Amino acid sequence: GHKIKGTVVLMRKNVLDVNSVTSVTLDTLTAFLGRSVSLQLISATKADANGKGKLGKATFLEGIITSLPTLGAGQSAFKINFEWDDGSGIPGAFYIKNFMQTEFFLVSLTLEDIPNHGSIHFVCNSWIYNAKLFKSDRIFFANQTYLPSETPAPLVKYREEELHNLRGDGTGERKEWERIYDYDVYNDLGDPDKGENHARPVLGGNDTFPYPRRGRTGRKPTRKDPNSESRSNDVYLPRDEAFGHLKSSDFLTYGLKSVSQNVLPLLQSAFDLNFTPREFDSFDEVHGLYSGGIKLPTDIISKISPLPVLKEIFRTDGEQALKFPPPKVIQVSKSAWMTDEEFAREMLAGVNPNLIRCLKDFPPRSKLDSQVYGDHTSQITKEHLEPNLEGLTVDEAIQNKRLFLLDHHDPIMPYLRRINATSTKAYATRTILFLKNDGTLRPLAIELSLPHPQGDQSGAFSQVFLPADEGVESSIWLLAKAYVVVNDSCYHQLVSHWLNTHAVVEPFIIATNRHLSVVHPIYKLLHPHYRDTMNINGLARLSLVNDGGVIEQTFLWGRYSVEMSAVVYKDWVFTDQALPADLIKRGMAIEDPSCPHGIRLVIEDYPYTVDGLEIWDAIKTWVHEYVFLYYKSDDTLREDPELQACWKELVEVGHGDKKNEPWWPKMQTREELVEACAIIIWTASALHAAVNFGQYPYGGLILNRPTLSRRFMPEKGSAEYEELRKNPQKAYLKTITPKFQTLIDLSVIEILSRHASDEVYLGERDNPNWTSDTRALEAFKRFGNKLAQIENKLSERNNDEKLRNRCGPVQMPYTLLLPSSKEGLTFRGIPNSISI
């Protein structure tokens, strides 16, 4: 015989829930001690009748273990001594039953053994509901990573049964307690039944609007059309994908849900009433927003204070003033944002640093069909480029790759005639920039295009504006740049941030969980990079991207916003997301072996990329060491049933609209798996951090990143032109985002740029001890240590005076891609996952 000693570490529901956490021995713990929680061991050695493990007698939990050197916060440990003997062999898993009717978060189980066998660890981290809601029993497996042979033969059937239980068929309305994973189409976002005007086109499953699938939540469809699904306030996402917190303001999801639920209506009211004016009359009135805040009544102020998590997001006077924090962009100079040098610098080191291209043939073309400006070009004034700096000719400078383009002409042009039928007067833009002889970039022309003055075949109504610094000229130029910037803010929310990151990544979470058992080595590589992404994504469909959401209301594309993001999905090709691939695709880097990342950069002074290539290569070296420690040969891989099922399923199903694309890796080689895995970790950690954490630092001055255009360019000698002349600022303010959306936008982007105190960053942070594989842990440490070396290289780079696109006119050292951050609206820190 032998009693194996176990110590079960756990967390009680109230330690983790928002509704209790509203506050951040005492033997609650006694309740666990009746015939309340029972565990039961499973062998990885002795096999019953038809192989299936062998279950050592259900044991209940006795005695509270008061301390342990390792207990941590909100965790309770319990002791449980299992009866066991030589003849049952080694425990490799365990069943668990909660009878308490209050779920608890199981953290771990350690067994201190009986043969020459060290302490077996189980890293559970999962919610255990009441044993009656389940029809089977929650099984948990030990610490050992096994390739999909499903290795210890007693375990093989237990390994395939859970896999089967997490897929759980595509039927029914998913409940709070469920862990079923499956795909569905974006048919979730509109509400047809509150009017036809409230319908939104189903995204995915068709060619006009292809889209990545999202998690199936199983609700009853809409009444006025069965193809869409009923709205609801609680969107299901598989339990344990929804992450608890020990303190609030860490419930940053709660910040967003209540900003839309409660804050946006009560605030709305002051603009539908009168205590606030509706337009800002001066740049001064905007800068006063984080000086004294917005004088509002206590009917909004006491109502919008104690609502949890939205503390410090709103700095308050105490009463009648909701302040905002100064965004980093004006902390050294309140006026440097207007600088050409800055507008051009944010294309490389800004919130959206990701899009610029080396112009190869002038004039840039559209890539729009037979409606003949696609089969035609940019009307840009070749004979109006280079205002003082270098006087080369066009091809001399294209030979030198000194000209670059921000082309925002094509995604919005189909929808422009419609966006301009409403209240917003958008302007399809492109802008040619010349790399100043000293490393900086300089905007030489913006081309403001409209559709179809008389028609729509040969429909491009282009007007190019050129830089100037005195009089109406500079005021017109400023509004011109304002029209680029507003286009780049919808492109950044809907495509660079939500599409290229949150939407694209959710099929992988669903496919991984449905097919790669927890034990699998690849699953443990990938798992930490999925933390809360299905949860924040559940809330985006509930509030951010739905029928009357903040994005529809706050961004240029308006109601056509996510549909336009699905048209651009037409072009998303998985492999060009890989950073050096992306830099080449855009003609920002040429291949060159000699140069330290296998490619040479045009605009070498370029921060996002110089820094990010460092983090890419670090991820790629980690994943290659990890992959190659389990796969012996390419045949090992090709034979892996769990990896193969997985890849098959997200190509054909999760990214089902794209199933037939020729660029997809067939997972037949290692190095193809290094590449797929390296791209998903990049997207889930450094791309989303790069694209998301500079949002308030830059976009907190609505002046510097406006989201909405209300007027077309001031005409000739007309009273709008005369208003410019006699009051440029009031003219500016009434072209860009009105004040009620400026206030909604700074609330939502303030939250989106916040690091929760319990953020697990890329910087080596896993979160307990996930594997037995010493080789892996060691390799993990090398990753973590290379990242610390990277952070120092990157900060050293911010002090090189010869690198000025790192800082620019309002000395804002590019810190977005430094791995660690402490906790706030810190402009750095790469999380492991898309979490906000």
Tell me which residue has tokens 């595509």: 170
Question: In angstroms, what is the minimal distance from the CB of 541 to Fe ion?
Answer: 13
Residue type, 794: L
How much helix, strand and coil, in percent to the nearest 5, is found in the chain?
A: 40, 15, 45
Q: Which of 492, 497, 520, 597 is catalytic?
A: 497
Q: Which of 245, 502, 515, 597 is catalytic?
A: 502
Q: Which of 128, 510, 834, 836 is catalytic?
A: 836
Question: In angstroms, what is the minimal distance from the CB of 255 to Fe ion?
Answer: 13
Cis amide leading into 363 (omega within 30): yes
475 binds Fe ion (CB under 5 A): no
Question: In angstroms, what is the minimal distance from the CB of 48 to Fe ion?
Answer: 48
d(CA 343, CA 477): 12
- In what helix (H) or strand (E) does residue 590 lie, and over which residues does it extend? strand 589-591
| Cβ proximity to Fe ion, 260 vs 692, nearer residue | 692
d(CA 427, CA 417): 10
C-alpha dihedral sign at 262, 267, 270, 271: negative
- How many of the other CB atoms lie within 10 Å of CB of 245? 22
d(CA 461, CA 448): 8
Question: In angstroms, what is the minimal distance from the CB of 34 to Fe ion?
Answer: 44
CB 702 within 8 A of CB 289: no
Question: In angstroms, what is the minimal distance from the CB of 225 to Fe ion?
Answer: 30
Task: Note if 384 is an active site residue.
Answer: no
Residue type, 620: K
User: Long-range pairs for 765-770 at CB < 8 Å and ≥24 separation?
Assistant: 765/528, 765/832, 766/528, 767/528, 768/107, 768/108, 768/123, 768/125, 769/121, 769/123, 769/143, 770/123, 770/143, 770/524
d(CA 251, CA 24): 11
Task: Name which of residues 444 to 463 contact Fe ion (CB under 5 A).
Answer: none
Report whether 624 belongs to an annotated binding site: no
Report whether 688 belongs to an annotated binding site: yes
The two three-digit tokens of residue 114, written as one number: 């009986």
d(CA 605, CA 531): 34
692 binds Fe ion (CB under 5 A): yes
Closest by alpha carbon to 444, among 409, 491, 397, 488? 397
Q: Which of 121, 529, 688, 755 is catalytic?
A: 688
| Cβ proximity to Fe ion, 692 vs 729, nearer residue | 692
| Cβ proximity to Fe ion, 537 vs 742, nearer residue | 537
| Residues 6+ away with beta carbon under 8 Å from 203 | 185, 186, 187, 189, 209, 210, 211, 562, 563, 566
CB 787 within 8 A of CB 764: yes
- How many of the other CB atoms lie within 10 Å of CB of 116? 5
CB 506 within 8 A of CB 578: no
| Cβ proximity to Fe ion, 178 vs 506, nearer residue | 506
d(CA 181, CA 175): 12
Residue number of the CB closest to Fe ion reads: 692
CB 741 within 8 A of CB 748: no
- How many of the other CB atoms lie within 10 Å of CB of 415? 21
Question: In angstroms, what is the minimal distance from the CB of 325 to Fe ion?
Answer: 19
Binding-site residue total for Fe ion (CB under 5 A)?
Answer: 1
Task: Note if 692 is an active site residue.
Answer: yes
| Cβ proximity to Fe ion, 100 vs 836, nearer residue | 836
| Cβ proximity to Fe ion, 561 vs 692, nearer residue | 692
Report whether 529 belongs to an annotated binding site: no
Question: In angstroms, what is the minimal distance from the CB of 502 to Fe ion?
Answer: 6
Task: Note if 143 is an active site residue.
Answer: no
| Cβ proximity to Fe ion, 40 vs 692, nearer residue | 692
Report whether 836 belongs to an annotated binding site: yes
d(CA 316, CA 322): 5
Judged by phi (left if over 0) then psi (alpha if -120 to 50, else beta), residue 40 lies in beta
Question: In angstroms, what is the minimal distance from the CB of 834 to Fe ion?
Answer: 6
533 binds Fe ion (CB under 5 A): no
660: burial class by Cβ within 10 Å (0-12, 13-18, 19+)? exposed
Report whether 502 belongs to an annotated binding site: yes
| Cβ proximity to Fe ion, 222 vs 683, nearer residue | 683
d(CA 512, CA 520): 10
- At residue 401, the 3 state secondary structure works out as coil
How many residues are listed for the chain in this entry? Answer: 836
CB 200 within 8 A of CB 562: yes
Question: In angstroms, what is the minimal distance from the CB of 757 to Fe ion?
Answer: 18
| Per-residue contact flags (x/-) with Fe ion for residues 640 to 679, judged by CB under 5 A | ----------------------------------------
| Cβ proximity to Fe ion, 250 vs 675, nearer residue | 250
DSSP 294-343: B---HHHHTTTSSSTT-SSSSEE-SSS-EE-PPPGGGSS-SSGGG-HHHH
Question: In angstroms, what is the minimal distance from the CB of 695 to Fe ion?
Answer: 9
Task: Note if 660 is an active site residue.
Answer: no
List, in sequence order, every residue forming a beta bridge with 590; answer none if it has no partner.
600
| Cβ proximity to Fe ion, 431 vs 692, nearer residue | 692
Question: In angstroms, what is the minimal distance from the CB of 252 to Fe ion?
Answer: 10
Closest by alpha carbon to 583, among 561, 566, 607? 607
DSSP 240-266: TSS---SSSSS-HHHHHHHIIIIIHHH
**Is beta strand 460-465 parallel, antiparallel or unpaired with respect to 599-601?**
unpaired
The two three-digit tokens of residue 728, written as one number: 């440029």
Stretch that binds Fe ion, among 49-57, 631-639, 687-695, 717-725 (CB under 5 A): 687-695
Q: Which of 352, 513, 692, 832 is catalytic?
A: 692
Q: How far apart, in Å, do the first and last CA atoms of the chain sit?
A: 51
d(CA 773, CA 766): 14
Stretch that binds Fe ion, among 114-122, 435-443, 691-699, 794-802 (CB under 5 A): 691-699
Question: In angstroms, what is the minimal distance from the CB of 72 to Fe ion?
Answer: 28
Annotated binding residues for Fe cation, written as ranges, equal 497, 502, 688, 692, 836
Active site residues: 497, 502, 688, 692, 836
Please state the residue numbers annotated as binding site: 497, 502, 688, 692, 836
Which positions touch Fe ion (CB under 5 A)? 692
